[model samples]
Target: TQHLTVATLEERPFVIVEPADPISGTCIRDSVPCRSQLPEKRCCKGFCIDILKRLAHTIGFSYDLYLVTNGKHGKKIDGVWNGMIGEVFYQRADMAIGSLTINEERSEIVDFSVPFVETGISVMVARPLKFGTVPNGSTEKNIRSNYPDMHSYMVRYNQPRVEEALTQLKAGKLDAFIYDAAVLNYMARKDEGCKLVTIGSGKVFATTGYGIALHKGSRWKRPIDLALLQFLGDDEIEMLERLWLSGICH
Candidate 1:
């Protein structure tokens, strides 16, 4: 039996860390607590985790999951890779998953399984003003490459987390926060009073999809792709989206 080490990052609606069940004294899917000795243990769950579970089941493999230490999807800096992609590239982990966007630069370093979700870049505003995005992410990269005019401003306003950008937006500190459409859509729908809105034609800017990443030329690629294809064909991915992405904003 093959056991794999999976790397991930916590992202709302995609991968979320939740408090472990007290009575059961266990985390769902035998997930290890992200941090030890907490008042209550916290474990991982959400859309991506669900997909990982199904893939493991379908592929007949077992896996242990851990959050990426750098908390990045993967970005190259000074010729060195960091984040989940680096984990795979460095063979620190067998696979990585989350809202990891599939792109050319990344493909050179790792193989991406069939995309599980289609997404794009978008601006999230509170019916108003300034904007920014997560630094070193696909959103920022796209902005830097394609939307050069806006790149300078984004570089200045770059945030480390999407939640921070949204907070600043709501606080009137920033007029807009640009990032992945799927994430912004989830945030806007879940926002209190439904005050946030995702604006702009995201598809017109950059359309992409989130895919599971594996070490380049890894043997698991074909198996993972086959399982993903099956899930896509059976509408399991669609059902997961509906279950996790449907928001309270009506």
Candidate 2:
């Protein structure tokens, strides 16, 4: 029998290879396990991991989690999307999870399951930013108020700069940081001083869902989607969110 192989990165709430249970579910580590790192940063498990375990049980297949010794989570954020797609195309892993985004470029190489959770890019900092000054905040109005012009050439806020607001906070510089709530939480958990003060509001942020990635010919796609649909009413997602997303990172 062909075991389902999964390619993943260390993403908080979405996926984490930690020792904690129930929330993290089952975990798989590749090569020699680093025992010293176990107590602190720890090993496999998190919100998305629980979902994957349940999905596996429902779909009837086993999986192995391959950490990205090199890739998005491991490497600098080039959005090394091409490398991710390439990994799937070559059969490096059966599927890619952990905040995999569904877009046209990636679709060219692999397929995605219907998004399970809808989210968007919003900054997470210790302080709330002045609206308009930057469009990475609670709502567009608040953010817009701080900006001099709606289309200011300097008004660029995206993934890479998500840390800027937090930097401001650390230097006692700014009031808050704006970025994806999940990403903020992940960073917060690692850092002792930072905190994510908010989630997001309409306009400035759009709702987006995360989809699972699979090699074009892989067998695990549809079944996991079905499993998610089956458990939509359950507290599974909520539980994962509390422990991983909004909880520990910061």
Candidate 3:
């Protein structure tokens, strides 16, 4: 069985899940056990899932998609890592797929596929207000880790989660909630009243890239990288943007 274990966490427009409200039976795609015969198509939607599916189809491999036990993508803690990043660090899973940013620290421990998405930390605020108008920067420190380039520019208000930061900003406890551009775009699209305005590159921090992470030294790295390079063509990129990255807030 060439089945691989893949670690994923629920982050909107990334690794969306369709829980087994009614779990299905075993499956077959490409004549192999789809998702290793999982009873349900749990991770059946979103950008990372879609991309991973394409790679599996092109590379002829199977994987079991499961959430990280801690339900986090991971961050450094006392020189060690926790959450999905920890899982990959310890080889608990073969790889990770999501809006996981490709960073120097993580790259030191694991192999990352060529960046499939390029973006940065962007500020989201209510209508008619620019990100510059805000006085403070707020986001979970874990997320903040991705933006080392912005450390001095944005004040660090370390919250526990993205939603918490957004809530605090909405209630005036905070002035700005900085998060991934793609995520802010998704939130804005679903909420017309929020009137979310995403500040472009100049205001955002660190124009970085997102990639899939593989266990360091894993044999699966090269093939997956190759597949990603081939699959991320213009048409596919456009399709993903149409489905996820609506730059305007509704």
Candidate 4:
């Protein structure tokens, strides 16, 4: 009967938590009812939640999920990483189950489980190229060097919410935002009037893949990997992918 802390961030369709839902009579706070005094579904809902639930059950452990206040998946700073990866790096959380991309820089500090999903980095522009420039909230350093032309086009806006950034985009205060193609695709699909469209050469900015990030040489690594292997095998991953990743928003 051990408790684990799982770190996550709000990157929709991947780590969507409902925050509240109707309990049986009163209301259940914890989805999956871990505390013996809570409830299910509302507290946590999304593709990763289901996968984590199954993994925890299979591994014979219980976990309390928390989010990175800064909304960064992980970014290196001052010779160290911060955000969800930092949470795990400092042993504050057992692991991260969000859409954390696996890359060379991160692999040095934390270990990543086998990639469960594959995606690419791309840009989402709001049609007309006006006076406004790209106002994305992302602060990662990779973007600057990867797209050198952004040296002049990128308008570093620190708006905490994507919705706020989207609003700026629509009103011509911002021209575009670059992000994961999957995320932008979801936004475009759900967007009314197709306000934001995927422009450019229609190629991946970076061929990115997501994984479970854990502390280097952590004890939980083996069990988690085994559980992930079991869950992703035999069409279960395919089922989840079809439901969340591929399903159209209606």
Candidate 5:
């Protein structure tokens, strides 16, 4: 049996870092402290974790899960990739997963498994004004290339985190926030006050899929893809979406 180091990030409904059990002490966020611990001891739990568990079971491999040191998703800066992609690129981890989008730029540096989820860049507004997206992400790249007008208007409103953008939107600081459709949909559905709504379906600049990132020419890519295809064919992925992506708001 083979063992692998999996790098992930905290994203709602996708990869969530559960709070540590107070009695068990603070949860170790990195792999080293949890290296010898059982799976239950791992501090993460969510959609991505469920998918990873299924993949491991199907492939007959064990893995140690850890959060990427920098919370941002992979971004190319000064010719160096950072976030989970950097970890995989530098061989710090065997694979990286979460809501990692498959795009032309990222594909050149890392192999991506068949897309596990379909999503697109969307605009979210708080009951009404200007828009922005997370910096250094595929959404920004798409806007910059495909929707220059929108990009020009939104460049100044870029926010580091989705939560921050949402906060700004609700505070009337921004008219809209552009981000992943799946995440925006999730957030809109769970908005207790029901003040948020996603728009611009007719103007969705890029429709994409979220894929697992692997080191270039990695040996496990084929096996992971095969297992993912099997899951897709069996509608197991659909089942997972229902289980985790379902909204609780009325």
Candidate 6:
């Protein structure tokens, strides 16, 4: 009869335990290993995990962290968020502890806490990749040119001639990657070779907010939102950022 079992997973501490996946302070790692097309692990560390951990504790709930397979099991193909959500849907996990954007598609399956951190879609690069030097070479360029939904993606992201830009970035061997800032924040702190670069920050015409996601109609959404509002003010959020985002690595 315990419908409200508080589940707690070790998001940051778990990632840092691995030498190959070290955590810097309270900050999450967002770097080369994570951003690669064939990422060994899904995005790790950073704001999403930090905020969730803080919020959950402030609300006074006991939880058990369900450790999934381990490093990079959720990544694959640059990165995929749905697989993790699928786990939540199947009851393997109760909720996701990260900056999951509230979109039309995802909203269909889950409810999200009120917008917490406002950030826009952006890219992460590791010293700017140099293309045409290795790995598929010209063939890589061809893959973008022929994507089935190329036209739609260009318009959606306002990425005028995205295929061209993507190809050029690849051809020039530039390690250019596009995703949300929250996602990048998770990567930069973990991987030494990767860094978050704000490219479209000035694009007033573009932006999005990050929210905590719940499985469909979970009761925890309201309490978590209240916790987020409470934490937003004062030193709580700032302290979290300093520890996780701006802290120096060990």
Whole-model Cα lDDT of every candidate shown, in order:
0.82, 0.54, 0.65, 0.67, 0.81, 0.45
> Between the candidate structures 3 and 4, which one is better when assessed by TM-score?
4
Off by over 4 Å in 1: 28-41, 200-204
Descending-lDDT candidate ranking: 1, 5, 4, 3, 2, 6
Candidate ranking (TM-score, best to worst): 1, 5, 4, 3, 2, 6
Candidate number with the higher TM-score (4 or 5): 5
The number of the candidate with the highest TM-score is 1
* Predicted candidate 6, C-alpha RMSD: 10.1
lDDT-best of 3 and 4: 4
- Residue range 1-250, candidate 2, lDDT tens digits: 5477676666555655555334544324421111221122335566666777777777887776665543352111244433344456666767777765555556666788877776554544453343212332223323344554643532543223344555665665554454444455456655664333554321225445677878786566767777787777677676666655563432
- What is candidate 3's CA lDDT for residue 133? 18
Q: Please give each candidate's TM-score.
A: 0.91, 0.62, 0.77, 0.79, 0.88, 0.54
Q: Candidate 6's error at 8, in angstroms?
A: 9.3
Q: Which ten residues in a row have the lowest lDDT in candidate 6?
A: 131-140
Q: Tell me which of candidates 4 and 5 scores higher on lDDT.
A: 5
Top candidate (lDDT): 1
TM-score of 3: 0.77
Task: In candidate 3, list every pair of residues with a backbone clash.
Answer: none
Clashes by residue pair, model 5: 129-175, 130-175
Error of 4 at 103 (Å): 2.0
Cα lDDT tens digits for candidate 6, 115-186: 776655455444322322111111122224454354233332232223343444534434554544454444
Look at candidate 6 and tell me the lDDT of residue 3.
31
